[PDB]
Amino acid sequence: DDAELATRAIPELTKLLNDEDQVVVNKAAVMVHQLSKKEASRHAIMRSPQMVSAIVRTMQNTNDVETARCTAGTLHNLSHHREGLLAIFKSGGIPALVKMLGSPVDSVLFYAITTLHNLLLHQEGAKMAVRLAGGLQKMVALLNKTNVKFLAITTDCLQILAYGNQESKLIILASGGPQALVNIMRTYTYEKLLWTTSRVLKVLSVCSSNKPAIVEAGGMQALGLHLTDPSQRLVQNCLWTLRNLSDAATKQEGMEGLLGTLVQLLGSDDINVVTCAAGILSNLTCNNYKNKMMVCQVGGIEALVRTVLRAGDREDITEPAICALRHLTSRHQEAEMAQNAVRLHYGLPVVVKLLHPPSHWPLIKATVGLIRNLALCPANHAPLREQGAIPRLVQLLVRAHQDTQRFVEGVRMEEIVEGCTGALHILARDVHNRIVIRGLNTIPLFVQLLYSPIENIQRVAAGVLCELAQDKEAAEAIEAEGATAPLTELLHSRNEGVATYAAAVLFRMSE
Amino acid sequence: XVTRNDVXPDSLLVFX
Ligand SMILES: [Cl-]
Question: Where would you tag: which of A73, A136, A381, A399 has the fewest CB atoms within 10 A of its CB?
Fold first, then answer.
């Protein structure tokens, strides 16, 4: 092989590169490049600190595109070896290469970004080095190029540098990262680039700065395009990102495509896919009635009821599935259809079951909120009674009220007291439900709740009592508990619900 | 991780 010749050549070629004649520099740059193309002589170049330092200074300071291309090309080749990568680093190559990410030669940009890529992965010190040389700003600026292989390398450098570095995330945000990354997701079909870009947006999705910029750049809809891709890793990184973003996207429009796919993904064999879909749907159905309607239009109620059945005790599925059903069963034109659909798709038994152990407080709290909504539909009154909702709602209520007189699993018991009394307020619309509720000897507790300093507890207590006091026997029980005392104080409340309900109970107890 | 935030009648599960 060459070997011998390569070594004797380097010393001369180094001197030629540092020459005044920019024609001699250029012919040297070309033969240096050519040597770098054979393993024999490539090892020669990497052994020579002076030669590598000469290549980095030529590239950085040349005006021949040919010698920019050739010198960068040489660094590309050196960067495939341990000796070469350390050489480039020690020769101050990282600042040089970052300068070359402003080149208006495509071959130079390619060689530059691949070299920095090999350094970021294979040379300790290079991540901090590239960051301090302003590599992020240069790389985000390059996200407007159109070569899918180049972009795949650029987005991969951005992911490496953004990961667990909150300054780099803010630099990517401040340089216009999110808009560029979203634009990639809705232009290119190249799986490696889409995947790498989805992984960048994932790192950024947990940053409370970037999160809203990604959503406003139209990132929900763009990531949405890819949820039915053949590539698992693409779909999964998109799902994870959407989940991270979803709580900031409740006010986005044009989300019908997404919501349709998420209802379809509830049916996945992969329980991770089902769980992310449930959580995203939970968030996007949060106070947005267009979303609530769209999810109902595409079989959402049935699909969620089936997720809850499928999930069993796995509370990571049931909590967001139940919150979604809760959001879908209230405050939108199709809330009444949904309340019926839960019953017709055999949801009521599983829903009432989830009020019991082993359910934890957050699921029980969501389940109470849902039962409260389901009970707005009169056709649910008897079914819910028959599944024993009422005695279990009263048992939760008493415990919460006893617990509050000294909270648990990241839920306030004051919150269980409101929910349960609210659900009982609505169920109490049915005369058979009222007989059961009275039968549990609850009127004394309801009256003590009128002494709660919490407006919302005052309102539901006065609420259920107002329903009970329809019937002579209850109106007499309520009066006998000295309810007129707190009720006439709640008369003069700033809260409309409280004062309106207080007045109703009082009227139903008067001469 | 996950944080629960009530938004009037409805709730948000904030996922990192
Ligand atoms: Cl499963």
Answer: A399
Task: Give B 1-16 residues with CB within 8 A of chain A.
Answer: 4-5, 7-16
The structure was resolved to a resolution in Å of 2.6
CB neighbourhood size of A77 (10 A): 20
Rounded to a whole number of angstroms, the CA Rg of chain A reads 34
Length of chain B: 16
Experimental method reported for this structure: X-ray
Among A309, A438, A437, A432, smallest CA distance to A378 is for: A432
Domains and CATH numbers, chain A: 441-511 (1.25.10)
Start-to-end Cα distance in chain A: 115
Handedness of CA A40, A41, A44, A49 (dihedral sign): negative
Contacts of A286 in chain B (CB under 8 A): 7, 10-12
Q: Please state whether A218 falls in left (phi above 0), alpha (psi between -120 and 50) or beta.
A: left
Put simply, the answer to whether A410 touches B4 (Cβ < 8 Å) is: yes
As a whole number of angstroms, the distance between CA A101 and CA A212 comes to 29
The structure tokens listed for A255 are: 């989300």
Contact, A490 vs A450, CB < 8 A?
yes
Determine the Cα–Cα distance for residues A466 and A468; give it in Å rounded to an integer. Answer: 6
> Going by C-beta distance under 8 Å and a sequence separation of 6 or more, which residues neighbour residue A252?
A215, A218, A220, A221
Q: How far apart are the first and last CA of chain B?
A: 5
Strand, helix or coil at A275? helix
In A207-366, DSSP assigns E strands to none
What is the A317 CA–ligand 1 centroid distance (Å)? 10
Q: Tokens representing A439?
A: 């039968």
